[PDB]
């Protein structure tokens with residue numbers, strides 16, 4: 001089997017991407033944030049504290065003939081941006097782009113933190129990291145990908161995120177028309193539950209490539225590119241007037257700037273992030289100070305190849321017995 005679904009930026013800055021997902025019988029379609037940095041499929045629901053719902057579409061298990069309470073199971077998750085959610089669990093039929101899993105754990109939110117409430121466009125998350133990170137207790141549950149894997153034509157999914165445009169998540173096949181050149185594959189460590197790999201280095205604009213190992217994760221659920229302070233300083237030093245602002249919470253730059261590109265290494269291959277991808281716009285409405293899309297990972301404890309990096313590439317998440325990651329230009 002295979003599946004193919006379009007993923008769409010939630011706003012004009014590509015702050016996140018949402019993908020329609022069918023849950024239950026008859027189908028209830030929710031727009032979920034596909035997140036290769038976590039492993040819980042959770043949704044706003046009829047059980048979510050009413051004051052914490054503001055415009056989201058909710059899953060109502062009582063209206064699904066295939067929903068079953070997973071008795072005794074609870075979940076609770078805290079993310080690296082300080083947000084969180086928790087609740088109980090149902091199993092139900094879940095379909096993405098024509099690919100169906102029966103008996104998928106659908107984690108129903110009873111509580112969500114303020115940033116979830118405040119984002120009306122995201123109805124929940126669909127985790128695509130390794131199932132070892134799943135938070136359901138006392139019986140850990142499998143991700144949608146893990147459940148689908150054996151049925152897929154090939155045990156893979158691909159992320160093809162757009163810049164200011166829709167893109168695609170495919171399950172079970174590699175669309176050879178969706179990228180240029182060849183796909184370069186690189187080793188993955190699953191020891192922390194993430195799609196963790198080692199970049200071979202970087203360049204800033206038209207500068208020389210610096211060969212250096214940068215361990216990090218491929219995370220579709222993080223918006224920005226978080227790298228070591230040395231690398232980030234070298235980037236922003238090429239932008240007149242750029243500086244790190246403790247009050248704003250990262251590097252800012254004059255909105256009048258033209259940003260240089262940023263290249264990262266994948267083995268002997270190179271992925272180029274255009275300068276425009278690194279512009280996240282005014283820090284507040286009407287400000288001439290703009291927020292940067294490359295930020296320091298110092299304090300976070302891990303480097304993160306988030307959407308800013310991934311959207312410059314066609315990315316293969318290879319879930320074979322020994323997982324790997326593939327990157328191609330596009």
Ligand SMILES: c1cc2c(cc1[C@H]1CCCN1)OCCO2
Pocket residue numbers: 035037079080081083221222223226300304
């Ligand atoms: C977003 C942004 C982050 C982050 C974690 C996240 C979570 C929120 C839900 C999906 N991803 O960790 C620190 C870097 O920024």
Ligand SMILES: c1cc2c(cc1[C@H]1CCCN1)OCCO2
Pocket residue numbers: 013015223224248249280281282283284291
């Ligand atoms: C834009 C502008 C900002 C900002 C964050 C953003 C984007 C980056 C990813 C999600 N929101 O924080 C600091 C103020 O300006």
